[PDB]
């Protein structure tokens, strides 16, 4: 019982994802190369990767139905607070549970816990990050549910600094109703409710992952020798 508006929304989000996610990872060749050999040897490569993904998340967010009906300040607030979470979400497409790594094409662009360690982060973040990727992968989401979850995570009225929270909620409500209805067409109860509840829990997990990444990013970026290796976009989005 997907309405034609709900079918329209899913078609829009699927296309937006296909225009902002490159499964070939061809643009990785333009990043500063990874050094693995202590110095934060993977910070330059991973900073470029994160910077590249921030751009993709902005491109995806712009195509969410209703997002551009918000003020520019609310668009900025929603993107600044959600960029880290959407990166963790969209990274799950490359995550594989064979060796707990993000496989993006080749061994050069295959990242494990030690590579994240090589960017300055500790297990306080990486251990919660890995169990998130595993639990998300075990859901075996359809691409429809995946792109809906990313959009819902962006248009969240539960963000500090939001001005028109009621408008943000109304936009999220139709994405949420679209996701709930899509699940019901593919899963009878109670499995239908067990899936949507686990997806909302993943959004809750991202909030604590958001908090821990910002704590470690603040300690890392406070050192000028580290922030020198970042990009201007990362400094703007992750800093102010």
């Amino acid at each position: 019982k997907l309405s034609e508006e709900q079918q329209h929304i899913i078609a829009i989000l699927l296309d937006a994802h296909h225009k902002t996610y490159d499964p070939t990872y061809a643009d990785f060749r333009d990043f500063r190369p990874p050094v693995r050999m202590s110095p934060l040897s993977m910070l330059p490569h991973l900073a470029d990767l994160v910077s590249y993904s921030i751009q993709k998340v902005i491109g995806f967010a712009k195509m969410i139905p209703g997002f551009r009906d918000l003020t520019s300040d609310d668009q900025i607030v929603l993107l600044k607070s959600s960029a880290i979470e959407v990166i963790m979400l969209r990274s799950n497409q490359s995550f594989t549970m064979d060796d707990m790594s993000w496989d993006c094409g080749s061994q050069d662009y295959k990242y494990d816990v030690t590579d994240v360690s090589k960017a300055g982060h500790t297990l306080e973040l990486i251990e919660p990050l890995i169990k998130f990727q595993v639990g998300l992968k075990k859901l075996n989401l359809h691409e429809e549910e995946h792109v809906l979850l990313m959009a819902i995570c962006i248009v969240s009225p539960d963000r500090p600094g939001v001005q028109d929270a009621k408008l943000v909620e109304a936009i999220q409500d139709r994405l949420s109703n679209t996701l709930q209805t899509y699940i019901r067409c593919r899963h009878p109860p109670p499995g239908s409710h067990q899936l949507y509840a686990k997806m909302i829990q993943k959004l809750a997990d991202l909030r604590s992952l958001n908090e821990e990444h910002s704590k470690q990013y603040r300690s890392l970026s406070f050192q000028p020798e580290n922030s020198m290796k970042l990009t201007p976009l990362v400094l703007e989005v992750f800093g102010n």
């Binding site: 751009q55 902005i58 491109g59 712009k62 520019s72 668009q75 900025i76 993107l79 600044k80 201007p232 976009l233 703007e236 989005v237 102010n240």
Partner: peptide, 11 residues
């Protein structure tokens, strides 16, 4: 507290 790069990408 100003985001000229995000604004440019949002435009």
């Amino acid at each position: 507290k100003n985001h000229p790069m995000l604004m440019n990408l949002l435009k």
